[PDB]
Structure formats: C-alpha cells, structure tokens
Amino acid sequence: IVEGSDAEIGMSPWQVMLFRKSPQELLCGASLISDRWVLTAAHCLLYPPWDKNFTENDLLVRIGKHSRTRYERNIEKISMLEKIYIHPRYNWRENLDRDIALMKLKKPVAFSDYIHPVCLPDRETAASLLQAGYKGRVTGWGNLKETWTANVGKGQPSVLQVVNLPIVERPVCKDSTRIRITDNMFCAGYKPDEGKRGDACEGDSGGPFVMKSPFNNRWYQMGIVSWGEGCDRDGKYGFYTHVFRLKKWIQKVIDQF
C-alpha cells in the first residue's frame, strides 16, 4: 500500500496472507469469507505469462496477522489448502477479466478477536454503494512505493497497511489506460487535482476492497485488488474485481463444494 497508514489491531480481521511455502514469501493478500473459504484474485494463483500456476501444496494462508514478517504466536493461525477454484472465464491472456478465485481450507480456522469473516454484498447493497465518489478501504502488506525498495529505503511495511480510496467514474477509469476495461472491474483512487494520494502496490493484490454499509453497519467486500500500472502514479487508478458481478460463480462453487 502506497501512502496508507498502519492498521489498528483487529481492524481487518478477514485479512489473509497468501504465503509461498518455499522459498517463504508473501505472494498476495486474500480475505476470509467463512471458516473454510478464502477469496482471492485468480492471478495470484494462475498467471501463465510469468510461469505461475500454483497447486494447493505450494501454498499456506496465514490468518489473524498484523506484523508482516513475524510469526505471531497465540494470534495468527495457519490453514492449508484443500482445493483451489479459479473462475472458468478468468482472462489472463488479455486484461485479467473475472480475476477471482476461491480456496477451500482443509479445516475450519478458529474465529477470534483477530480472525472474523467479511460479508459478500447482496445486489442492493452493491447498487447503493458502488458509486463514483464513495470510498472503500484497501489493506495489505505490499510495497510502500513503486520504486523497488525494501527494509532500508522505505520499501516494505512492518505491519498491515490501510488506505481509504474513492471509487472513480467508469469513463475516467477507461480514459486512464490502454487496457480494455470490463463490467467485471471498477477502479478507485484520487485524481491529480484532489491532492490526497494512495494505491495498492506489489504484494497487495488478491486482498480486499471493503465498504462499511451505512444501512446495517457491516463490512462488505466489494472488490478484490486486481491490477494497476505502476503504483500511486498521477492519472492512474487501481483496478479491482467487481465481487458482486461474479457472486453467482462464488455461490455456485460454495454450494457445490
């Protein structure tokens, strides 16, 4: 996350870290939607252009975390993947259309003060909140800057980062890039005139874009960190998978498996 701030403890209890077993590294963010289902971006698991095609045993998910690098004893829980399900029409060849995947856990993770699921939007909540100007929240352990940096030149965070960003009008999203945008995507971020900044960055993808419903005070995951060009560049916006638009697939997978 670029230009965000440290998350408060228990602020994003549905946050999940997708961790490569060997070599141990942060691959992506993800979100907890029930005790046995984790939601993420399909490109976190499958992206042929980069020779990426993970299998269940290549990965581990860490839930309940705050610190990026530390093993958080008595707090975080490790869960293993029983099965990965990628949207059948995920378009990795062109524009990451339908960038969504589900991971079923081998055993249910135990909820606690630091582990709790986020809700998925119903049609009405999505129609009401997914509007230009309305802000959502992005969280992750990704890089703090576009310019390749680590723990020596303000590169990676010590703890979970958070940033609130406004959804952008679709024509403005379209006009900011040469990539073909689809209805299964929305973009968010501040414009150059607005002053405030912020964006997701390397390592944040797969993570959640959430909104707190003013109708029932519950947090809903409206998007999945999908793609961008650079990080926090003026005139560019982060792109997110439209979760409600792909919910039929989500429901089909969960009901079936």
């Binding site: 141990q24 590294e25 942060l26 581990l60 860490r62 690098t69 093993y71 490790i78 293993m80």
Partner: peptide, 10 residues
C-alpha cells in the same frame, strides 16, 4: 526476511 513458521503451527 520472514521469521520461520514453527512446526506444530502447520
């Protein structure tokens, strides 16, 4: 730079 995940935890 990741602290190792102790067995038992897995």
């Amino acid at each position: 730079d990741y602290e190792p995940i102790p067995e038992e935890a897995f």
